[PDB]
Amino acid sequence: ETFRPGGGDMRDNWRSELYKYKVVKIEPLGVAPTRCKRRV
Amino acid sequence: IRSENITNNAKNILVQFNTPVQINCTRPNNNTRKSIRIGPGQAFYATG
Amino acid sequence: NLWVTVYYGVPVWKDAETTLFCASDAKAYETEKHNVWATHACVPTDPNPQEIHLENVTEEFNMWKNNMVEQMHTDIISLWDQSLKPCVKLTPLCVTLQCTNVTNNITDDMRGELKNCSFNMTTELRDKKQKVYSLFYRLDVVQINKEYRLINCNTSACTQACPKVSFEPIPIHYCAPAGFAILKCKDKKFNGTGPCPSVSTVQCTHGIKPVVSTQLLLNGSLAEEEVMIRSENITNNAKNILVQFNTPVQINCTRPNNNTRKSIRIGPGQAFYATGDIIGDIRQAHCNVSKATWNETLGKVVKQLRKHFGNNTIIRFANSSGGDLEVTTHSFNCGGEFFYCNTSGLFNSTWISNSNDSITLPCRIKQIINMWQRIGQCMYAPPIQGVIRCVSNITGLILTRDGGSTNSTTETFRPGGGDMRDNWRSELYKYKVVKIEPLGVAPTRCKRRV
Amino acid sequence: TLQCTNVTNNITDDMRGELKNCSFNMTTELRDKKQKVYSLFYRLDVVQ
Amino acid sequence: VFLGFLGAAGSTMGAASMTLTVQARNLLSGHLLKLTVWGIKQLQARVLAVERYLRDQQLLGIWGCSGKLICCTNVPWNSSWSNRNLSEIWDNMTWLQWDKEISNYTQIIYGLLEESQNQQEKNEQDLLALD
Amino acid sequence: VFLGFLGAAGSTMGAASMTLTVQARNLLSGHLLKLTVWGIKQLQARVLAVERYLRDQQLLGIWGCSGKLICCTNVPWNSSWSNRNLSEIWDNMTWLQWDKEISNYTQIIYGLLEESQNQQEKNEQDLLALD
Amino acid sequence: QVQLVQSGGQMKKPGESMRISCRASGYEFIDCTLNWIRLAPGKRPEWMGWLKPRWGAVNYARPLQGRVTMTRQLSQDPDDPDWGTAFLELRSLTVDDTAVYFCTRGKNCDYNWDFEHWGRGTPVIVSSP
Amino acid sequence: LTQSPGTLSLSPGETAIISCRTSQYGSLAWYQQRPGQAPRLVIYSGSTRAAGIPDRFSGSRWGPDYNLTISNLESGDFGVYYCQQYEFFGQGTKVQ
Ligand SMILES: *[C@@H]1O[C@H](CO)[C@@H](O[C@@H]2O[C@H](CO)[C@@H](O[C@@H]3O[C@H](CO[C@H]4O[C@H](CO[C@H]5O[C@H](CO)[C@@H](O)[C@H](O)[C@@H]5O)[C@@H](O)[C@H](O[C@H]5O[C@H](CO)[C@@H](O)[C@H](O)[C@@H]5O)[C@@H]4O)[C@@H](O)[C@H](O[C@H]4O[C@H](CO)[C@@H](O)[C@H](O)[C@@H]4O[C@H]4O[C@H](CO)[C@@H](O)[C@H](O)[C@@H]4O)[C@@H]3O)[C@H](O)[C@H]2NC(C)=O)[C@H](O)[C@H]1NC(C)=O
Ligand SMILES: *[C@@H]1O[C@H](CO)[C@@H](O[C@@H]2O[C@H](CO)[C@@H](O[C@@H]3O[C@H](CO[C@H]4O[C@H](CO)[C@@H](O)[C@H](O)[C@@H]4O)[C@@H](O)[C@H](O[C@H]4O[C@H](CO)[C@@H](O)[C@H](O)[C@@H]4O[C@H]4O[C@H](CO)[C@@H](O)[C@H](O)[C@@H]4O)[C@@H]3O)[C@H](O)[C@H]2NC(C)=O)[C@H](O)[C@H]1NC(C)=O
Ligand SMILES: *[C@@H]1O[C@H](CO)[C@@H](O[C@@H]2O[C@H](CO)[C@@H](O[C@@H]3O[C@H](CO[C@H]4O[C@H](CO)[C@@H](O)[C@H](O)[C@@H]4O)[C@@H](O)[C@H](O)[C@@H]3O)[C@H](O)[C@H]2NC(C)=O)[C@H](O)[C@H]1NC(C)=O
Ligand SMILES: *[C@@H]1O[C@H](CO)[C@@H](O[C@@H]2O[C@H](CO)[C@@H](O[C@@H]3O[C@H](CO)[C@@H](O)[C@H](O)[C@@H]3O)[C@H](O)[C@H]2NC(C)=O)[C@H](O)[C@H]1NC(C)=O
Ligand SMILES: *[C@@H]1O[C@H](CO)[C@@H](O[C@@H]2O[C@H](CO)[C@@H](O)[C@H](O)[C@H]2NC(C)=O)[C@H](O)[C@H]1NC(C)=O
Ligand SMILES: *[C@@H]1O[C@H](CO)[C@@H](O[C@@H]2O[C@H](CO)[C@@H](O)[C@H](O)[C@H]2NC(C)=O)[C@H](O)[C@H]1NC(C)=O
Ligand SMILES: *[C@@H]1O[C@H](CO)[C@@H](O[C@@H]2O[C@H](CO)[C@@H](O)[C@H](O)[C@H]2NC(C)=O)[C@H](O)[C@H]1NC(C)=O
Ligand SMILES: *[C@@H]1O[C@H](CO)[C@@H](O[C@@H]2O[C@H](CO)[C@@H](O)[C@H](O)[C@H]2NC(C)=O)[C@H](O)[C@H]1NC(C)=O
Ligand SMILES: *[C@@H]1O[C@H](CO)[C@@H](O)[C@H](O)[C@H]1NC(C)=O
Ligand SMILES: *[C@@H]1O[C@H](CO)[C@@H](O)[C@H](O)[C@H]1NC(C)=O
Ligand SMILES: *[C@@H]1O[C@H](CO)[C@@H](O)[C@H](O)[C@H]1NC(C)=O
Ligand SMILES: *[C@@H]1O[C@H](CO)[C@@H](O)[C@H](O)[C@H]1NC(C)=O
Ligand SMILES: *[C@@H]1O[C@H](CO)[C@@H](O)[C@H](O)[C@H]1NC(C)=O
Ligand SMILES: *[C@@H]1O[C@H](CO)[C@@H](O)[C@H](O)[C@H]1NC(C)=O
Ligand SMILES: *[C@@H]1O[C@H](CO)[C@@H](O)[C@H](O)[C@H]1NC(C)=O
Ligand SMILES: *[C@@H]1O[C@H](CO)[C@@H](O)[C@H](O)[C@H]1NC(C)=O
Ligand SMILES: *[C@@H]1O[C@H](CO)[C@@H](O)[C@H](O)[C@H]1NC(C)=O
Ligand SMILES: *[C@@H]1O[C@H](CO)[C@@H](O)[C@H](O)[C@H]1NC(C)=O
Ligand SMILES: *[C@@H]1O[C@H](CO)[C@@H](O)[C@H](O)[C@H]1NC(C)=O
Ligand SMILES: *[C@@H]1O[C@H](CO)[C@@H](O)[C@H](O)[C@H]1NC(C)=O
Ligand SMILES: *[C@@H]1O[C@H](CO)[C@@H](O)[C@H](O)[C@H]1NC(C)=O
Ligand SMILES: *[C@@H]1O[C@H](CO)[C@@H](O)[C@H](O)[C@H]1NC(C)=O
Ligand SMILES: *[C@@H]1O[C@H](CO)[C@@H](O)[C@H](O)[C@H]1NC(C)=O
Ligand SMILES: *[C@@H]1O[C@H](CO)[C@@H](O)[C@H](O)[C@H]1NC(C)=O
Ligand SMILES: *[C@@H]1O[C@H](CO)[C@@H](O)[C@H](O)[C@H]1NC(C)=O
Ligand SMILES: *[C@@H]1O[C@H](CO)[C@@H](O)[C@H](O)[C@H]1NC(C)=O
DSSP: OOOOOOOSSTTTTGTTTTTSOOOOOOOOOOOOOOOOOOOO | BOOOOTOSSSSBBBBOSSOOOOOOOOOOOOEEEEEESSSSOOOEEEEE | OOEEEEETTOOOOEEOOOOOOEEEOOOOOOOOHHHHHHHTTTOOOOOOOEEEEEOOEEEEEESSOOOOOOOHHHHHHHHHHTTTSOOOOOOGGGGOEOBOOOSSSOOTTTSEEEEEEEEEOSSSSSSSSEEEEOOGGGEEEEEOEEEEEEETTTTOOBOOOOOTTOOOOOOOOEEEOEEEEEEEEOOOOOOOOEEEEEEEEBBOOBBBOOOOOOOSSSSSSSSSOOEEEEOOOOOOOSEEEEEEEEEEEEEEEEOOOOEEEEEOOOOSEEEEEEEEOOOOOOOEEEEEEEEHHHHHHHHHHHHHHHHHTTTTTTEEEEOOOOOOTSSSEEEEEEEEEEEEEEOTTEEEEEOOOTTTTTTEEEEESSSESSSSOOOOOOOEEOOSSOOOEEEEEEOOOEEEEEOSSOOOOOOEEEEEOOOOOTTGGGGGSSEEEEOOOOOEEEEEOOOOOO | OBOBBBBOOOSSSSSSSSSOEEEEEEEEESSOOOOEEEEEGGGGGGOO | OOOOTTTSSSSSSHHHHTTTHHHTTTTOOOOOTTHHHHHHHHHHHHHHHHHHHHHHHHGGGTTTTOOOOOOEEEEOTTTTTTTOOTTTTTSSSSHHHHHSSSSSGSTTTHHHHHHHHHHHHHHHTTTTTTT | OOOTTTTTSSOOOHTTTTTTOOOOOHHSSSOOOOHHHHHHHHHHHHHHHHHHHHHHHHHHHGOOOSOSSSSOOOOOOOOOOOOOTTTTTSOOOHHHHHHHHHHGGSTTHHHHHHHHHHHHHHHHHHTTTTT | OOOOEEOOOOOOOBBBBBOOOOESSOOTTSOOOOOOEEEEEOOOOOEEEEEEEETEEEOOOOGGGTEEEEEEEEEOOOSSSEEEEEEEEEESGGGGGEEEOOBOOSSSSSSSSOBBBOOOOOOOEOOOO | OSSSSSSEEEOOSOEEEEEEEOSSOOOOOOEEEEEOOOEEEEEEEEEOOOSSSSSEEEEEEEESEEEEESSOOGGGSSSSEESSSSSSSOOEEHHH
């Protein structure tokens, strides 16, 4: 296999530094079953 | 070695070292930047 | 045994800084005169400011470390710059002029002040060339080799001010945003810094006139009951001295010529206005001030300047020491043309510790102004036609003392306007912007039920 | 329209004609006179 | 008895605690590039005024003081912050002199309130749970 | 016992339900055209962060959970969504595995809460009306 | 950094003027002031006068009123705005003006009188024979 | 301003005091000129040492009086010393 260099894109440089990262959004609501019975 | 798919050919192959090889990129000339008035208040710098 | 208890909305503030926004009155916006301080895109003000007078509160004020004058000086520049982008560059004017002296009707003091420059110029079509002539002052032409050239053509181009806009200062107001508050010192003996024991919060400050001047603050707001002297430190020399009168001396700044504004086509759809001829005779533009109320007003300041230096020093005045033309002379824009007036007749006295003659100040008029000392800007003021004359107050006055003599029996005060924000700091000294901190805990006797 | 020529002041044979001494008319600060200047452009910046 | 905005700034703390409504209601209110000069000065002021108000309302939300002004909590007054009478705190001073007095003990208190609430809601949910 | 932001993401659901304060407090925080390059990226982020927070606070407002974190409601757990023990839901799993489990039954629940509140406020207003 | 590259020493005669230079470079020149101090060999140091380089507003010392004059010359290059020179000229020299002339500058330019940065000196010797 | 002692002839290691009797309320500052160079700032605002000072220098103010007590005299310290208010310099004290 004869490997040759080539830099045909300009974003392959920065993808070698933003590979550890990923951006996620917090979804803070959440329901769950437990034992509550409301008073009123 | 990173790749989106190592068997594909259109996909690049990103290698990432652990020790950095050093590069010494130089230019031996001693050129003189010389200003040139082009119009009012606009300069153009050229190797004299 | 006492218990923590929150309280939302207590009157508790802190010293802060923010971006205060504009405000202006009604008919200064609906007339649509396209003022250079564009209050037509600004917020219209309230019908009346709710000047709430607080009680029992002594706020620590300071007029020298204020931040409203750093924010006004940025907004005046960005209004004087943004209102020049839709105007025409005078880049086809940098040609080789061929000037000569005008001797139609010339008095010997205005002997060679204005030259009759006649130059080739590109027409509306991009291949023919007309031959025009004009009238430039000697402060706008330098010599080349008689062939002349403009004073700017080796340092920048020049947007001509569009004659639709006008440099007359409409009063603008500064309002705090939501959550902030502006505190106005209603004291009368507040000198520069300290507890002003009569505070009064204000949603929107009064009409601040964005006028620019040097050595003589014009159309200001007058301190009542006295003539006051402000300084950041009266013993320092680098710090200015801002005087503020109680009675305004009157100034009559006129120009006797009757010049004809003449349009010139430069390229397509871009005009360049130039003085064609002077109708009648040519004389020097002067400024009047009555000496009976001026020498009285200098007699008020010396009586108030002898509090900081002693009641026996020979207070002396003198005319400006050095600098270029914007600091060594009184500089203003009366009605759209820039006067550089020589104030060596005013500041010449000596007080040794014990009527219609009307002192005249001869002025020179320039057109290639700079006005902010920014390398790369210039604004060829278009010539206004007819005689031009305005009548104005002189409320403030800037002084700098000088040097050291090891002998405190005399101090020779000289005028000088080395900064452009000392004018506006003589109108934003009462104000300070604070942010409300509405939360607050306090101990009382609450015990929660559940 | 530039008028270039080869520089041979001190030239090694690998950088033989890589840089040319281009001398061209140019508008001055005034919009009716014209100066005559010169410069040094590489061969990757000039076509014939 | 309508003073106005900040009108009881130098008044008594026992009487400035009765005019909290007006300082709570004044914490949010309301040829081409000249619209953008005053616009970005106005738009940066309106968004900052909102999220400053929402911060002090959320911070008040997690203490058991969701929609109140005079809300009182569980944690007692630690006397190391101040040892004064209730008459020497409430009906003689002013709120500006009071804020300089306990400016060092704010974040001590603001962590004491959040822990007394999360203890409270986990004990309320187990009190009606047995229900 | 201060974990930090998202610090109990892989912890137990019975112990991530005791650190809801820190993830609730981190949902809003805080030569000419170069101010406009970073500015419109910052101003579009601050306004979006506010109205995203106000949406989840308004949606929490119409269930009877106005200013609470652990709020519990009237509608019972429909066992078709899940049939598990309370020990197999609370003190062994994590919240990320739980959200994938009932991701199909969110909007079924979020309509069940709004109708149990509008039934509740119309019955509360007729209970104290006879008053 | 702040560099005050001064001029070279001169050897005048009684009656002639002088003109010494001072080139300030490294900081923004058109904001912070300058100064001009001379150090006699056997006398006090003597301050002579500042120069706010925007508009060149000067203020000379009262024993040198009407003798010293101080100009400036800004940089009209839009590429390099933060440099500029400053000149001095002392007419009607005497034997008493034998000193070394420094062009100082404040520490931070909100207070002037902390002369941190100085110049290398311009030793002017005025002798009668 | 007035500096008291005039000359100080000491052996390297001793302590040396210099007192600048001021007159009006100004922030004093001290200068040190070795022969053959430009002076430099050592103390400003009365007490604060300048940037790059080996802390062998010390300023102390009692009203209309200031001191400069150098702790241990070294080789390159035997110059002359000026105190500087607003624009007024001292008589100069040559330590040697
Ligand atoms: C331009 O800017 C400059 C520079 O900023 C300004 O200069 C400053 O001007 C102010 C004017 O108010 C001066 O403040 C006054 O300074 C004197 C001197 O302080 C020194 O002496 C203190 C005690 O020494 C005693 O004995 C000597 C004799 O040797 C007397 O001369 C003294 O008066 C005393 O009796 C000593 O303690 C001081 O050190 C401390 O304080 C100074 C600031 O003063 C600090 O920098 C130090 O770090 C240190 O903390 C110092 O050595 C003070 O005596 C004056 O204080 C009096 O009043 C104070 C309240 O205003 C009070 O708190 C003091 O205790 C003291 O009280 C006296 O007066 C009272 C009146 O009610 C009496 O009741 C009381 O019993 C007592 O009699 C005051 O501090 C600054 O020093 C001066 N700064 C400098 C650098 O020179 C200049 O004014 C500006 N110009 C303008 C117009 O803007
Ligand atoms: C400090 O404070 C003083 C006091 O306010 C202030 O004085 C003012 O001076 C200015 C400059 O002269 C005055 O503004 C002008 O006044 C002249 C004369 O106006 C009188 O007569 C007219 C008749 O119509 C009345 O309407 C007016 O109210 C006065 O009684 C006017 O002729 C000026 O109008 C021209 O310039 C305007 C600039 O805004 C244009 O908008 C306007 O359309 C006019 O220009 C055009 O028409 C001209 C005629 O055809 C033409 O030749 C031009 O080329 C152009 O097309 C203007 O109103 C101001 O009123 C004075 N205020 C008072 C009460 O005295 C100082 O200026 C001030 N600042 C300083 C000096 O620092
Ligand atoms: C744009 O054009 C301007 C005018 O053509 C240029 O101004 C000139 O710049 C040169 C140097 O760049 C100056 O020359 C020297 O002048 C100084 C100061 O002195 C002379 O004039 C004053 C009176 O103003 C007089 O008092 C002095 O004694 C000098 O005779 C001398 O110290 C030098 O030794 C040298 O002679 C010109 O003085 C100056 N002319 C003016 C009218 O200011 C400007 O530089 C050009 N800008 C650009 C970017 O090229
Ligand atoms: C600002 O105004 C002052 C006075 O109002 C100007 O000072 C005067 O300048 C003139 C020349 O421009 C001096 O005149 C000469 O007059 C003497 C008579 O004293 C004569 O013998 C000479 O042959 C020469 O013609 C005049 O003396 C002088 N005034 C004083 C009191 O000395 C000043 O020049 C003005 N500023 C500017 C920048 O022009
Ligand atoms: C306007 O332009 C014309 C032509 O460019 C100038 O005319 C000539 O001036 C040069 C000066 O070197 C003479 O050598 C020619 O003989 C002139 N030719 C003619 C037909 O006159 C004219 O001088 C320019 N006008 C001004 C005021 O500069
Ligand atoms: C400046 O201008 C004003 C008005 O333009 C002049 O005032 C007139 O002065 C006379 C004095 O004899 C008064 O009787 C008039 O009432 C004034 N007004 C008018 C409209 O005529 C003043 O004389 C001028 N000169 C100065 C102040 O030196
Ligand atoms: C200074 O300017 C002001 C306005 O810019 C002139 O004032 C009004 O002048 C009249 C005439 O006396 C007074 O009755 C008004 O009270 C003034 N207005 C205000 C708001 O007070 C003033 O006359 C000018 N000064 C001189 C000496 O003419
Ligand atoms: C700069 O411009 C001048 C005039 O435009 C050029 O001079 C002429 O060149 C033409 C070329 O066709 C000749 O026919 C003329 O005889 C020349 N006249 C003179 C007076 O020399 C000049 O060649 C230009 N310079 C460059 C480097 O192109
Ligand atoms: C380049 O030339 C300049 C001017 O002759 C000189 O000062 C500099 O030292 C030269 N540089 C080298 C590396 O020779
Ligand atoms: C100015 O010059 C033009 C052309 O020479 C002439 O027609 C006009 O009369 C002159 N005007 C003056 C004021 O000299
Ligand atoms: C034109 O005026 C200037 C200055 O007023 C003068 O120096 C020049 O000699 C005058 N021209 C002629 C031809 O007299
Ligand atoms: C203003 O005056 C008061 C006394 O009336 C004085 O104490 C204060 O120092 C003065 N302000 C300044 C800046 O000197
Ligand atoms: C100026 O000239 C024009 C045209 O001749 C005339 O209408 C006007 O009255 C003149 N102005 C004066 C003040 O003479
Ligand atoms: C100003 O002073 C001049 C000087 O002679 C005088 O002629 C004139 O009448 C005065 N007043 C005005 C309004 O110009
Ligand atoms: C100025 O006024 C004072 C008194 O106020 C008087 O003694 C003096 O003579 C006046 N000077 C002039 C030039 O009128
Ligand atoms: C100076 O004398 C005046 C006379 O009017 C007096 O009011 C003032 O108090 C005196 N000041 C001093 C420091 O003696
Ligand atoms: C300046 O004042 C002096 C003395 O009062 C006088 O001789 C001289 O004529 C005055 N100059 C002017 C221009 O008023
Ligand atoms: C480039 O050309 C100019 C004009 O012919 C000449 O003066 C200069 O010496 C030349 N330089 C080189 C490197 O050939
Ligand atoms: C100038 O250099 C180029 C390339 O190095 C070459 O092709 C050309 O022949 C040279 N010119 C002459 C006159 O030899
Ligand atoms: C201000 O202080 C006075 C002191 O007599 C007090 O009676 C009053 O209640 C205070 N508050 C107001 C608003 O006047
Ligand atoms: C009270 O505060 C002190 C510190 O100010 C702290 O050490 C102490 O533990 C606190 N005690 C209580 C009961 O809050
Ligand atoms: C608050 O703390 C600072 C240091 O952090 C201290 O200087 C100050 O005296 C303290 N305030 C009180 C009232 O203890
Ligand atoms: C992570 O998993 C381990 C498994 O042994 C468990 O003990 C621990 O409580 C979990 N959580 C954290 C925060 O470590
Ligand atoms: C439970 O959910 C199922 C669908 O998952 C639905 O058909 C049924 O009606 C629901 N029953 C109750 C009591 O909520
Ligand atoms: C949720 O619904 C999708 C189709 O809408 C289905 O593929 C998926 O299996 C469902 N998830 C569960 C847990 O039933
Ligand atoms: C300065 O030193 C002398 C030495 O005895 C001492 O008497 C004086 O009190 C000192 N002053 C200060 C301000 O330290």
